[PDB]
Every structure is written in structure tokens, then in C-alpha cells.
Structure 1
């Protein structure tokens, strides 16, 4: 048993190196398909996966030759635990292959969607990224908005109903083979905490009132713009008017809903263009930010192998921005169809946060080369993006000119941040509440579409621009739903990124609550080695410890908390509550009529 724990350590040392290498090969094939969708690359990705799944199955089986639960070392027990978790790889060989073909079908459908120009039904090569997204973010013609919404959702959503259904059945069977109740519990296992769901319910209910105030004010402002025929006072907001295809963030309509329209509203897109920014510049600036904090510089493989602009050769590819770890040394990459905008600048930093995490933990053993939990991975880049979005940072890099930071410009910037950060929370909760409710069997197949729009109404108070029914199937019109990417990570990120940002700001000397000149919402952590250090301590851990331990490394705390995100927005809350009362703004909404059962 002592003898045995010593051999086990050697077994792990060696098997970890082998999984890195086999995964490397699967990652390269996935990369090739995602950057160039073809039948041939599909076949290749899916065959290499099939093979890696088969080997994982043998590894799981050989775990039972070791008395690992009897061992002394927490660390060895943790690695063995992690090797027992097969996920889809637990499926019979044939079911696994079917599942991969189902996943390919959906993701490739999403990526190849094209629609006809509203103004020209002969031009039929408009893609979400960038053509349809540009209209949704910029047009204030409600009818054009509605048209693109229907065209998109009909092709990206409804077209893959039968595929989505088989995926739920196979996902459910895979979870049961791992002895989880459903896919919901399989995802939740990543957070290592039996009360996790409850914890988020608690946090969500504490911020909901702020969301409802924001919702109410936006609805008021949209009525003055579009008039009462297009937006009602008491009903859900028509989602097509909120500047995003899924209404997940509303910051693209800030110019019509901002508190003080005569005071400055930060939008540096136009200046980025005026100064000749490219994608390459944007990523080099993101690099600069990380190295400024004494973190690790992008390696050369990054620059040689990343794809940072949409190919011009008319190939099909997944443009949904992503970051990739190849599981060797220093081979990390981003695939981003980058455009020169303010919000793409933030995305660049978002993505490079994943890359940094990968570089920070690449000396760990294979099974620890992932986030402390999924939410940690998503948060890293957003802590930087927070800084980058500040007027402070933006004047430093010359993108924001002639800005005066009076009380009214502060409220504008606060609100603008809230349109991305508070608004998102209900949206993000719903993506997984929906999927969970299907995975767990709580909704009947006859009710699957209206169950989606029900959640969206109940939690976000938004609805489709047109009537939908069980003849439509709208959920897979969101990337992550079509691609089988758990979404809760993003809700977790949006809470915990404030815990990290506040703590990083304190460490940098950029925030003191008792000093009016260092308010949280204008903290820049650029150049702070103090913040950098705290990051290094947490990120270098990988998944070597449960996530509270990784948090504790960063700032000493162990609990996921809503206190920070509220502390950030508290000045907005005060003002906004008062402004809604001042203007007699109706808060809340009636039940949507847009989904017919």
C-alpha cells in the first residue's frame, strides 16, 4: 500500500504526459476543422476523438487496479479522481461516434448560416459575423431588425431541432454511465460544491432588483425612441431592439438610452480607426497589458499560428472567438475574426486571459492544466477588460480625447458598464437553466421551444419580435447551445471577476472606498506588478486544488460573493432608483404573448 502509492505516483507522472500528447493530436484536428469546415476535416476530428475516447475508457478501467481512495496523498487522490471522469467517453463506441456526428452537424449548421439582404433578396451571403451582427448593433429600423432576427433564428435554431434532441438523449445517457443523474449534474460537478446552484440563486436574487431598475429605464428610453406602437410600458422588451441578437448585453444601444445624452459616452471605435489600429495592434496591446503586470508574454507560436482575422478565401469556419491550448509547451493560439471596435478590443483581452491561464499552468500535470473552475477561466481576461474600459485607461492610450469626468459622465460610464455586466446575468443563468431542465427530463418535448422563451421572459423580461411556437426551435441560435459549451461558467465569471478586480485594484493602490479620487469604477491595473503577482499565484495552480483554495491564493477569500459586483455598481443603483421614481418609470412586466403553446 505504501509500495503501491509509490508506483502509482510513477504511473500518473507517465500517464499524464501521455494524455497531453494524445490530446495535442485531438486539439490539432479540432483546430483544423474549426478554422476550415469541410467534410474531410469533420471526419478527421471525429475519428481522432473516437480514439482518444477509447483510450480514456482503458485508463478509467486501469484506475480500479489501484487502491487510490486508500492513499495518503491528497494530490494523488485528486489526479486519480480526475481520471475516473470520462464524460462522453463512457458511451459505447457507436453511441460516441453518433454523438460526435450530432455535435458536428449542429456546430457546422450554426457556422454556415447565411441570409438575404433585407434590401436585396439576390445578395444571400450575409453571415452573422460580421454582416448580421453589424445590422443588429447599428440599425434603429425596427422592421429591418425583426427581419434579420427571424432569418437568423429560423436557420440557426429551428433547422437543428432533431439533432438537438438526439444530443440531449446521448448527453443524458453519457451522464448516467458516469452515475450522475443527468448532464446538469455532470456540468455542476466541475464546481466541486453540492450547494453551488443554491449559492447562485442567492446571489442572483440579490442583484435582480438592480436588473429590474435597469430594464425599466431602458424600456422607458426605447419608448421615446421607437414610440408606443413598438414598445409597450408594461410588457417585455422586444429583444431585437437591444443591439444584440440574443439580447445578452445591451451596450450597443447606449447612445439612445444613456442617462445624460449631452455628457460624454465612451465609444472609441472611431478613434481606433482614425489612428490605424489593426487586429495585430490590438493583440499586441493586449500582450502589453499582461507583460506590464509582470505576467508572461505571448510566445512566438502564438503569433505564428493564431488566426486573428477572418479569412478572405471564402472558406467556411467557426468565427465565434476562442482560445486554444495545445498541451505541449508554449503552443497556444487564438482564433478570432477580429474587427476594430471598442467591444472587440475587450474581447481580445478576454481571449488573452485564457491564453495567460494556459501559460501559467503548463508546468502542471495534464489533469491540472485547466481552470480552478470554468468560471475562473472566463474571468481572467475580463478583469483586464474592466480596466481597459475605464476612461482612465482609455485616455492613457490616446483613444479617449477631451473627456471631463464629472458626476454625469461617471453615471453614463457606469450605466454603460451595467448594460454589459448586470444585464448579462439573467441571460447567462437562463442558458443553463434551460439546458438543465431538458437534461433532467423536466420539460416535455412538446413544450421545448416555449420553455425556452418562458425562462427568457421570466428572468430577463425580453421576448421575440414575432410570435413563435413549437414549430420553431430557437435555443440553438445561440453558439454555445449549438456547440455544447456549458454557459454557467459565464455567470460565475461575471460575479467572481468583480472579486478579482476589486482585490487587484486594492493591491495596485487604485481603489480606496474612503477616498473619492480612487473609485472602483475608474481603476486601471495596467503596469501593476502587485496585481500580476496575485494572478500568478492563483493561475499557476491550475486545477491542482479545489477552487476556493485558488481564490484564497489570489486575495485570501474562499467564498463566491455578490458583495463586490454590488459595491462596484452601488453609485449607479442610488442614482437610478431615484431617477426611475423621478420619472414614474414602470418596473416589471406582464407575461409574454410571443410563444404559442
Structure 2
């Protein structure tokens, strides 16, 4: 159609206008997250309401263009993106109420403080860093159960009524966009109507390995705490797993390591000894990206980022985040950085988001986002996989006197699995839970025990104390309180191994027939070949359906669990044999810790 001329001019101006309007909303959201006050809350929400009103007008104006009739797939793709209003489809008053509900939940989470286990006078312990410090380090099971209960009562139960209204308005918004529910609204980002089934299939392939790891960990925990604390046949008490949500278990590696007399990589002490700071950690992340011929952090990043928890009295959101301001080179991180191994990896994860921002900033506004949400989460994790290798850690002087024999290799593979395999059922359940509420599949009388039932069924973990429908535990996880879709992380954990394997081959760092080049010791630091693949993919933003973006990276078009299974194959062989040798019980009875 000749109208395509025009349409192209229309999109040109509109994209530029959206970027500028979104810059303004983003600044107000940054100010609030950096400094939680009633005044900043009001300002964030009023500017969002303003932009929502404009979006309503945009979606309306698309109907004046015959865009479905156009020759250009590119023009059609842009118009389609503009018709998708999300929450902005809601009536003015409903949108304002939703924004008020969202900030009530996020500020509740950020403001949680508990009393010291040993000093009921001292009541200023926050999750980050005080409570997380205990959960990751204490081996006093009663102390752990105390902090678990205090946190969940305050971050979870306290916001049930707000969470209920959020579900209602989220559903109403989805239906105004003609999605069945918000589950379908979220899934739309993956542009694939078999996406859920694809993930069920990949998950089913990896589940048996998870069950072997679970069995071995439970066996080792029984030896440490005794059978009064940990049963052989039941779900693992979750507070013993070194993470408030039991989402990753690497913090208890020193008590569950396959070979306790051989080295286990933990560089936190060496980081401190060498005088590492948050600034140094970010500079090192920047170095990694630039070493691969990727983009250096701009001056705005250094000038405007927050890389340490503020020491004034203020309330803020400490959960780490990366921010795109939709201009040129105005990108920032807010991280309450600590000097630990886990935090070094976290820094690289966040800088992965920043790199993606810089790579696609020349794209039209609607294309300035990930190919799918899993792509955005994957970027930094691919580098963190290299950072975590004995190979890399020796290069930067953090790992000393390391002998990489067969036993040390198993220890390192197991340590990696405690993050990478353990996470998979966890991440699947965060969205299976919310989807089921969104879809109206669970009665409100059953909402809490529906959460714990999924945690049991998929992860084989349970609360430390008996819960019931008088509690409401799901919002005790940040993303649930903050209305952040979680499937992105499951997709990320699968595809990051496809990216890592390919980048390692391109770097000459992995050859399956060369004993000297194992995938689990690959360091892509300094590889321009690996960097080129990233540039080819990331610079696309969301200009093409995601299989096109994967193709740009390594010639493949299919999400596949083959690469993650390849990485862990030596661990699988060893672990299956070890569990047989030690008569380790696999599987678990149904939990008794959530009362109907």
C-alpha cells in the first residue's frame, strides 16, 4: 500500500516521542527506588499515569493505519508492538489504583526490618545485608528458623490484601488487551504458542539430574544436622539450604561437597585480603566486556550509578537493578554491592543488561528491549560462567595453589550445579504459581497452600515451621512483591548454556574431543570472536523474532536443553554412581508443613 510511505514517517516521530516520554517516567522511578518517600511515590505514579494516557491515544491512532495490509514486515512489527497497551489499557482510575497497589507492595518489601535473634533490643536488621548474612553463614538450625519466620511474616503475610487487588487488576488489564489472563499477557513476549510445552519438555529431561542432586544434598545434611532435623524420605527443610528462598544452594557447599579434603573455590576471603571494593568490582566487569571487543561503560554510568548501600537513614530498594534511560549513553546500575564471590558474579549479571542497552540504543524505541526476556537475563551470566572457572580465578590472583585433579573437578561441577540445576524447578514454580492465580485456577481460600504445594512437587523443599492459610508467603520473594515476570530466568538458565558453549567453541576454549579443553573450564576473557557473536545478536534488540537473534549468534533457531546437559554430563555419571554406592534415597513424601 502507498500509505506505507506516510506510515514510516509516522513511526519515526512516534518512536522518538516515546523514548523521550519514557525517559521522564524512568527518572521518577529511579528517584523513588533510590529514595523511598511519600513524595517520590506520588511523583513516580503521577508521571506513569500521564504516560499511560498518551499510550491510550497511540493505540487508538494505530487504527487509522491499515498496517495489517502492509508489504513491510518491519513496519507491521512496529505497529503491532504499539497496539500492545498492557496495564495502560485500564480506565484512568483503575490504573492509578494499580500503581498505588504496586508501590505499597514494593515499599513494604524494601522496608522490612527484624529484631536480632540474640538481642530483642536491636530491631534494625534488613534482608540486605543483615538477614541474608545469617541465612548464608549460620549453621544453627533454630537461629535460621527464627529469621525465616520473621522475614516471611513481614515481607509475605503483611501484603495479602494488596496482592489480592493486584491479581484482580492484572486480570482486568489482560482481558482489556483480549488475553485470557496475565499468564497469557506474559507469555506473549516469547512469540511462540508452544512455549509452555517446550519448557515442560526441557524440564522433564533435566529433572532426573535435579533429583540426584537433591538426594545427595539431603544425605549430606543428615550427617551435619542429624535425623531429628532432616529426614531421609521427606522434603528438605528449606532454611538449611543457605538462601532465604532456597533458590540456589551454593552457600552450603562447604558441608555438602563431594570431596571435602580437596579444594572448593570460595574467593571471598581473598577479595577482602586484596582490598577489593565495589568500584574495583565494576571496573573489572567493564574490563571483561571490553576485552571481548564489546562496549566500554560511558561516563554517565560512573557519574550516576549507585554501587554501595547509602549510609544515611534512608529507605531504598536494595534488590539489584540495571536502568536504561532511552537517550544516548545514559545507563545506570543500583546495587548494594558487597565484597563476595557471589557478588562478583552478580556485578557481571547486571553489566550484561547494561551492555545490551548500549548495543541496541540505535534501534527505534519499540525495538530497544531484549529479543525475548530470557535473552536479557542470559548475557551477563554467560560471562559469569567464565568468571567462575578455576582458569579465570587463577588469572586474576583470587584462587591460589589450586590443583585441578578429577576430584577438584567434581567439586567445581557440583558447586556450579548447586546454582544452575537447583534453580530450574525454583524458577518454573514462581510463574506456575502466579499463572494459576491469574487464570483463576485456585480459590482464594487455597492461595497459600497452593504455593507450598508447587514448591514441594517441583523442588522437594518445605518451610521450617507449619504454615496455613493464615499466612501468605509468596510475596516474600522480591519479584512477586514487585510484579516482575520470572520465566525469563528459567529461559535464561537454559539458553545461557547454548550461548556459553558456542562462545567457548568460537574462542578455541572448548573441544569435546580434547581432554585439555573441557567446557567447565572455559574462559572467554579477551576473545574478540566470542564478542563478535554477542555484537551480532545484541545489536538487533527486538527488531526480529527471537529465533532470528539466536541464529545471528550461532546459526541455531531452537531453544534446547542439549547444551546444559552436555556441561553437566561428567557430574551426572559421577553422581549417579555415588548415590548407588551410598544407597542414597531419591524422591520425597508429600510435605505436612501447610495446613488446609
Is residue 237 from structure 1 mapped to residue 236 from structure 2 by the alignment?
A: yes
- In 2: Cα distance, 1:7 partner to 1:116 partner: 63
- In 2: Cα distance, 1:408 partner to 1:13 partner: 59
* Cα deviation digits, residues 238-290 of structure 1 (max 9, x gap): 00000000000000000000000000000000000000000000000000000
- In 2: Cα distance, 1:559 partner to 1:179 partner: 28
Structure 1 residue 401, shift from structure 2 partner: 0.3
- In 1: Cα distance, 2:210 partner to 2:15 partner: 45
- In 2: Cα distance, 1:149 partner to 1:55 partner: 44
- In 1: Cα distance, 2:20 partner to 2:123 partner: 43
Structure 1 residue 158, shift from structure 2 partner: 0.2
- In 1: Cα distance, 2:34 partner to 2:455 partner: 32
* Cα deviation digits, residues 446-500 of structure 1 (max 9, x gap): 0000000000000000000000000000000000000000000000000000000
- 1:67 match: 66
* Cα deviation digits, residues 385-410 of structure 1 (max 9, x gap): 00000000000000000000000000
- 1:220 match: 219
- 2:468 match: 469
SS of 1:466's equivalent in the other structure is: coil
* Cα deviation digits, residues 187-211 of structure 1 (max 9, x gap): 0000000000000000000000000
Within-5 A mapping of 1:572-583? 572-583=571-582
* Cα deviation digits, residues 497-541 of structure 1 (max 9, x gap): 000000000000000000001000000000000000000000000
- 1:533 match: 532
- In 2: Cα distance, 1:147 partner to 1:18 partner: 51
Within-5 A mapping of 1:43-192? 43-192=42-191
- In 1: Cα distance, 2:63 partner to 2:262 partner: 66
- 1:562 match: 561
- In 2: Cα distance, 1:181 partner to 1:375 partner: 23
- In 1: Cα distance, 2:314 partner to 2:259 partner: 45
Is residue 347 from structure 1 mapped to residue 346 from structure 2 by the alignment?
A: yes
* Cα deviation digits, residues 120-161 of structure 1 (max 9, x gap): 001000000000000000000000000000000000000000
SS of 1:65's equivalent in the other structure is: coil
SS of 1:323's equivalent in the other structure is: strand
Is residue 301 from structure 1 mapped to residue 300 from structure 2 by the alignment?
A: yes
- In 2: Cα distance, 1:582 partner to 1:37 partner: 55
- In 1: Cα distance, 2:397 partner to 2:560 partner: 35
- In 1: Cα distance, 2:13 partner to 2:3 partner: 15
- In 2: Cα distance, 1:69 partner to 1:551 partner: 26
- In 2: Cα distance, 1:462 partner to 1:317 partner: 31
- In 2: Cα distance, 1:65 partner to 1:121 partner: 65
- In 1: Cα distance, 2:537 partner to 2:164 partner: 39
Structure 1 residue 422, shift from structure 2 partner: 0.2
Within-5 A mapping of 1:171-320? 171-320=170-319
Is residue 454 from structure 1 mapped to residue 453 from structure 2 by the alignment?
A: yes
SS of 1:349's equivalent in the other structure is: helix
SS of 2:377's equivalent in the other structure is: helix
Q: Which runs of 5+ in 2 are unaligned?
A: none
- In 2: Cα distance, 1:37 partner to 1:261 partner: 45
* Cα deviation digits, residues 275-328 of structure 1 (max 9, x gap): 000000000000000000000000000000000000000200000000000000
* Cα deviation digits, residues 344-379 of structure 1 (max 9, x gap): 000000000000000000000000000000000000
SS of 2:187's equivalent in the other structure is: helix
- In 2: Cα distance, 1:7 partner to 1:542 partner: 25
- 1:516 match: 515
- In 2: Cα distance, 1:65 partner to 1:259 partner: 65
SS of 2:332's equivalent in the other structure is: strand
- In 1: Cα distance, 2:8 partner to 2:333 partner: 34
Superposed CA RMSD in Å reads 0.3
* Cα deviation digits, residues 430-460 of structure 1 (max 9, x gap): 0000000000000000000000000000000
SS of 1:494's equivalent in the other structure is: helix
Structure 1 residue 583, shift from structure 2 partner: 0.1
- In 2: Cα distance, 1:115 partner to 1:98 partner: 29
Structure 1 residue 230, shift from structure 2 partner: 0.2
- In 2: Cα distance, 1:80 partner to 1:307 partner: 36
SS of 1:168's equivalent in the other structure is: helix
* Cα deviation digits, residues 174-194 of structure 1 (max 9, x gap): 000000000000000000000
- 2:336 match: 337
- In 1: Cα distance, 2:345 partner to 2:276 partner: 14
- In 1: Cα distance, 2:276 partner to 2:364 partner: 39
- In 1: Cα distance, 2:407 partner to 2:299 partner: 45
- In 2: Cα distance, 1:545 partner to 1:443 partner: 36
- In 1: Cα distance, 2:386 partner to 2:289 partner: 12
TM-score, length-scaled by structure 1: 1.00
- In 2: Cα distance, 1:478 partner to 1:20 partner: 31
TM-score, length-scaled by structure 2: 1.00
SS of 1:340's equivalent in the other structure is: coil
* Cα deviation digits, residues 212-253 of structure 1 (max 9, x gap): 000000000000000000000000000000000000000000
Q: Which runs of 5+ in 1 are unaligned?
A: none
SS of 1:288's equivalent in the other structure is: helix
- 4+ residue runs of structure 1 moved beyond 4 angstroms? none
* Cα deviation digits, residues 41-71 of structure 1 (max 9, x gap): 0000000000000000000000000000000
- In 2: Cα distance, 1:3 partner to 1:55 partner: 27
Structure 1 residue 3, shift from structure 2 partner: 2.9
Count of matched residue pairs: 596
- In 1: Cα distance, 2:8 partner to 2:313 partner: 50
